[PDB]
Amino acid sequence: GSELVQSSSTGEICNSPHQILDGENCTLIDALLGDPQCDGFQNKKWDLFVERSKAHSNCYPYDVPDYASLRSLVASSGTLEFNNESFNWTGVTQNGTSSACIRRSNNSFFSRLNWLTHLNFKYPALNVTMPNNEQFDKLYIWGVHHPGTDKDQIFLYAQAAGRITVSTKRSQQAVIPNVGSRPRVRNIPSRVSIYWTIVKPGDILLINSTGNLIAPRGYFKIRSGKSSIMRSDAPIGKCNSACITPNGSIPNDKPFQNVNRITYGACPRYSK
Numbered sequence: 001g002s003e004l005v006q007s008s009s010t011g012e013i014c015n016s017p018h019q020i021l022d023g024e025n026c027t028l029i030d031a032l033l034g035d036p037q038c039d040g041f042q043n044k045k046w047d048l049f050v051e052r053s054k055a056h057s058n059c060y061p062y063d064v065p066d067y068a069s070l071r072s073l074v075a076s077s078g079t080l081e082f083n084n085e086s087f088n089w090t091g092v093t094q095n096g097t098s099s100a101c102i103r104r105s106n107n108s109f110f111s112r113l114n115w116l117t118h119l120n121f122k123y124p125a126l127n128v129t130m131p132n133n134e135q136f137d138k139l140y141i142w143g144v145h146h147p148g149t150d151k152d153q154i155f156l157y158a159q160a161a162g163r164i165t166v167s168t169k170r171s172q173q174a175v176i177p178n179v180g181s182r183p184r185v186r187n188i189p190s191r192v193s194i195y196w197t198i199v200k201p202g203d204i205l206l207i208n209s210t211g212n213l214i215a216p217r218g219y220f221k222i223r224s225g226k227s228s229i230m231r232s233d234a235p236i237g238k239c240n241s242a243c244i245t246p247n248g249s250i251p252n253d254k255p256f257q258n259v260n261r262i263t264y265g266a267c268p269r270y271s272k
């Protein structure tokens, strides 16, 4: 029967009763790192985050090796509560900026990251620690910088590229920066690779670096938690509905549904 299956929708997503966050030009990852279009998303919370097909990044060219996993982690958690922290950044210059990441017409950078360069032509071996003495877990986002040329590498860090090691008592992550010119993006042949690390209470964050480090300014709180993300170009209207799809919201009364596999909230079984 067809009275058991739902096939239609208004085409709109209803803004109630689930907290929906429309990304517009921004991906979740960009709102996390702090891309300048995405400054309004700071410390926002949500039950469902909606990515758009038109989304574009407009900052430093970067890649995230474990993109999906990170995008999914932060998704479930459903918060961007960030906390600034006082790292001991001695011996280095802070707040590097780029003409590729524009903010108020001035060269800037990802709001949540800290680009360290040499100070007086020295870049000491960093041995900096940040303990989690809190009750909850801390989520730290950091990166490694891959300059286009050796000339840039010496300009920025005053020595050749060496290993970056981010470890805790439970794990260790080690990256080797790779000097090499990758195709220009926003006139930038350099790249940044994004990595992440979770620190449990009583555990400690340990950073080891001789350059190429793109440092965190602090941590996000990690829930997880049942929130989510859906890729959809569907418009948003004012209404109430418990079940949302990428083709729009639908009512939750039939046992089945053939509009789309992906749903959030109290929904029918997909059938087809």
Ligand SMILES: *[C@@H]1O[C@H](CO)[C@@H](O)[C@H](O)[C@H]1NC(C)=O
Residues within 6 Å of the ligand: 025, 037
């Ligand atoms: C969305 O992206 C377009 C393309 O560059 C841009 O013109 C527009 O300003 C962006 N929207 C806003 C206001 O963030």
Ligand SMILES: *[C@@H]1O[C@H](CO)[C@@H](O)[C@H](O)[C@H]1NC(C)=O
Residues within 6 Å of the ligand: 088, 089, 090
């Ligand atoms: C930061 O690092 C230096 C060298 O390791 C140390 O001597 C200094 O006391 C530190 N500053 C703070 C506030 O811990």
Ligand SMILES: *[C@@H]1O[C@H](CO)[C@@H](O)[C@H](O)[C@H]1NC(C)=O
Residues within 6 Å of the ligand: 094, 095
């Ligand atoms: C670095 O930038 C942040 C905000 O971008 C600012 O609050 C801080 O004072 C800056 N640090 C230094 C030492 O300039």
Ligand SMILES: *[C@H]1O[C@H](CO)[C@@H](O)[C@H](O)[C@H]1NC(C)=O
Residues within 6 Å of the ligand: 127, 163, 165, 208, 209
């Ligand atoms: C961190 O990394 C380097 C390269 O492996 C290592 O030689 C150095 O001793 C380490 N620093 C600390 C804090 O042990």
